[PDB]
Design a protein around this ligand. Structure first.
Ligand code: CA
Ligand code: CA
Ligand code: CA
Ligand code: CL
Length: 208
C-alpha cells in the first residue's frame, strides 16, 4: 500500500490535500492524516482548530468503515511525538509553527479543490463535463441517470448512478483515471469506482 499524508485545514469549512510524505509538510496549526493502509493516524497540531480535528476524525471513521476492520485508526497529539507516526512518515525533525501554515480564514476563501464532473452518453457520444467546484459541490447534484466524478482534494470517485447507461457504467472508471492525468494531479492519486446505494463512507463523508 502507498502511504499518503493528508492535510486538513480551515475555519468555517475544511479542505483536504495530499501533501509530500515528510515531517516538513506538517505544521502545528492544522490536522494531518497519515494513511498507511492498515494503520491510519490522525495527527493533531498543538494549535489545531476544533473543526479541523472534527473532520479529520470523520475521515478516519469513514476510512475504517470502508476497510472493514482491515484498517485501525488512532489519534495522537503533536506533543505526544508518536513514534509509530514518524516511523511511517519516514523522517522526523522540527515542526513548522501555525503561522508557517498560513491563515485558516484565507484557506477557507482561497483553497477549495473539490471538483464534480458528469459523464453522460445521452447525446450518443460521451460528454465529460465539469458541473461545480469548491463549496458548490453539493450532493443534490448527483443524478441516478448518469455517472459522476468527484475529486475531494484527496481522492477521485467514479459514482455510478443506478440508471446509468451501459456505456457510462463501463467507461466510468477510465474517465475518472483520465481526469487525474489531465488535471495534473499526483500520478498515484487514489481512484475508486462506487455504486449508487452503496455505503461509500468516504465519498459520503465529503458532503457532511
Ligand atoms: Ca488550523
Ligand atoms: Ca445516462
Ligand atoms: Ca464529513
Ligand atoms: Cl486565521
Amino acid at each position: 500500500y502507498r502511504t499518503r499524508l493528508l492535510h486538513l485545514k480551515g475555519k468555517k469549512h475544511i479542505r483536504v490535500h495530499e501533501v509530500p510524505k515528510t515531517y516538513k509538510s506538517l505544521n502545528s496549526g492544522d490536522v494531518f492524516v497519515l494513511d498507511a493502509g492498515k494503520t491510519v493516524i490522525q495527527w493533531n497540531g498543538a494549535k489545531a482548530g476544533l473543526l479541523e480535528k472534527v473532520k479529520a476524525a470523520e475521515l478516519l471513521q469513514a476510512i475504517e468503515g470502508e476497510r472493514e476492520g482491515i484498517a485501525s485508526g488512532r489519534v495522537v497529539a503533536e506533543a505526544d511525538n508518536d513514534t509509530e507516526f514518524f516511523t511511517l512518515l519516514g523522517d522526523k525533525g522540527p515542526i513548522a509553527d501555525a503561522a508557517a501554515g498560513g491563515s485558516d480564514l484565507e484557506a477557507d476563501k482561497k483553497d477549495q479543490p473539490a471538483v464534480l464532473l458528469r459523464l453522460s452518453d445521452a447525446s450518443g457520444k460521451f460528454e465529460f463535463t465539469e458541473v461545480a467546484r469548491g463549496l458548490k459541490v453539493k450532493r443534490n447534484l448527483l443524478d441516478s441517470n448518469d455517472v459522476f466524478v468527484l475529486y475531494t482534494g484527496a481522492e477521485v470517485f467514479a459514482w455510478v448512478g443506478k440508471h446509468a447507461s451501459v456505456g457510462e457504467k463501463k467507461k466510468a472508471l477510465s474517465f475518472a483515471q483520465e481526469y487525474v492525468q489531465k488535471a495534473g494531479l499526483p500520478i498515484h492519486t487514489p481512484v475508486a469506482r462506487i455504486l449508487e446505494g452503496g455505503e461509500n463512507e468516504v465519498f459520503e463523508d465529503f458532503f457532511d
